[PDB]
């Protein structure tokens with residue numbers, strides 16, 4: 001119909017939703033497609049995880065830096081884990097606009113899970129602008145630990 | 147010799163109480179049953195078990211109407227239940243017709259199907275419609291039928307005659323294999339693979355390397371599959387292979403203006419056309435083709451009783467329409483459909 | 491924490507699960523695996539009016555419409571009817587879905603989705619779709635594959651249910667990822683798979 005009319009099922013008050021991203025920093029921000037890796041499928045395939053703006057965040061208070069991605073439209077978190085010492089970007093065999101990596105614990109689904117990701121950017125040089133910032137961000141963390 | 151609970155909408159979970167068993171009394175007492183119909187109910191595994199035991203005994207069974215019998219059952223329970231039933235059916239020497247349509251199967255329940263279908267040699271009419279087989283399982287079912295072909299020649303059993311397998315998304319994935327299933331059963335009469343997302347390349351094969359070998363073919367329906375020029379050309383070439391063709395259902399196949407053009411031309415060349423019902427809806431067929439199709443229907447298709455062009459690319463007004471309607475009038479036998487939805 | 495029971499129904503092989511899947515993993519499940527019976531998948535969304543949870547009751551497209559389906563329909567509060575834009579047969583069935591549905595729900599928000607609009611040779615074009623006009627439904631061309639409008643359906647129903655024409659999805663609190671320590675046996679064989687990955691090429695579709 002033009003605009004179907006229904007009388008509301010509930011009454012929900014306006015609300016201010018925080019991001020828990022306020023004590024941020026946001027070193028890096030660039031959109032890209034993120035991938036998940038097969039898992040327990042015995043069939044090593046790359047399953048899409050999301051397409052949106054990737055962000056690198058360091059904590060003003062503490063030091064901790066994490067990766068946080070949100071999908072377009074839905075805004076659901078498709079990647080949210082800390083950057084550890086033993087981590088880095090390794091080109092995806094073919095193509096250089098993408099890098100893979102391991103995370104002992106991702107929290108995109110608000111449940112600690114071992115994710116083996118891989119992100120791809122529009123232009124190969126954007127990947128460098130990412131890896132560079134990702135590396136000098138992984139460095140800022142090894143320097144941390146003793 | 148007929149047992150049935152059709153439409154009784156029974157939530158048949160177990161079958162153990164005094165009642166429940168009473169329902170299947172006619173089943174228990176009479177062993178000389180020919181047709182069992184269970185449609186319109188939800189059979190759980192437990193009840194499936196109890197009905198398996200009580201079906202093997204019915205050795206004079208000829209028809210198993212098992213369409214729509216699981217509505218509500220999860221992956222957790224259908225495969226088991228299906229297995230038990232198909233296990234029993236297998237033990238019926240005279241069962242030529244078995245129907246399993248309108249049940250959620252797909253890969254997750256291909257086991258009983260793959261088993262049964264390859265073995266049950268008495269099978270003549272298979273109704274596997276709207277089961278969501280999928281390209282993967284569809285293929286296995288197709289191979290499984292190729293087997294049946296063999297196991298059939300070994301026991302000098304009747305040829306398979308009807309395969310009604312549509313709305314299963316067989317896709318092109320399984321056309322390579324199905325085409326072989328047909329090469330196996332070249333004595334089919336009714337093959338209906340409607341709405342299987344089969345695209346052009348798929349139909350080209352399925353046709354030229356599959357059905358084309360079934361010289362005995364009487365009824366063929368490939369409704370709602372993308373044909374296009376590629377599919378059509380295949381169909382055109384293949385038409386000369388089915389002399390006893392009587393029903394050709396191509397509704398919703400996007401034959402394409404150019405395709406229909408040829409298909410029609412194809413018929414134009416056929417001889418002794420005993421065609422009796424041609425469904426050509428929604429195929430972008432253009433006026434120039436409908437023009438020729440008419441004269442052909444008139445001159446060479448003396449037995450046509452049904453035609454269907456609704457949905458194509460030619461005005462409901464255009465001369466040809468009346469000319470066609472006129473042809474059937476003069477004959478006293480004929481019937482064009484209502485063209486209330488032409489394209490463009 | 492508000493919960494809504496949404497019934498996803500429609501002819502088989504159209505996209506119900508694929509759609510729902512993507513909405514909770516982002517993955518585009520290309521493999522067709524028939525949904526036996528009904529699988530209840532919950533999706534949460536964050537709006538300017540708090541977080542809401544849709545309990546998507548994904549159903550099986552073979553099950554003939556009738557009372558045997560009542561279970562799914564009962565106490566629903568919205569629903570999505572789906573059909574394949576490349577299958578005329580699948581669209582022609584919409585009417586039956588929307589009926590076996592409104593028989594127990596009577597008056598509830600329903601969005602009609604013509605999925606797989608991404609496919610080249612399309613059959614049910616944008617124009618021709620009228621059914622929504624005659625039965626008070628919202629309509630959306632969609633593609634679980636290209637994501638085209640893939641979030642409008644929920645967004646709508648949400649607005650309709652919540653009663654806020656201007657409701658919209660917003661961020662999503664990004665909590666602190668747990669600890670992250672260990673190293674011993676809890677590692678090493680990871681590099682083994684990390685490589686089984688950097689090797690396997692990514693499905694480039696862009």
Ligand SMILES: Nc1nc2c(ncn2[C@@H]2O[C@H](COP(=O)(O)OP(=O)(O)O)[C@@H](O)[C@H]2O)c(=O)[nH]1
Pocket residue numbers: 501502503504505506507508509518519520521522523524525551605606607608609632633634635636
């Ligand atoms: N091209 C295309 N295929 C799709 C789309 N959505 C789903 N599919 C495919 O359609 C098939 C069936 O999906 P499925 O979720 O099982 O549909 P269901 O019948 O509702 O369970 C699978 O082969 C999917 O990959 C889409 O937007 N585009």
Ligand SMILES: [Mg+2]
Pocket residue numbers: 503506507523524525549550551
């Ligand atoms: Mg499904």
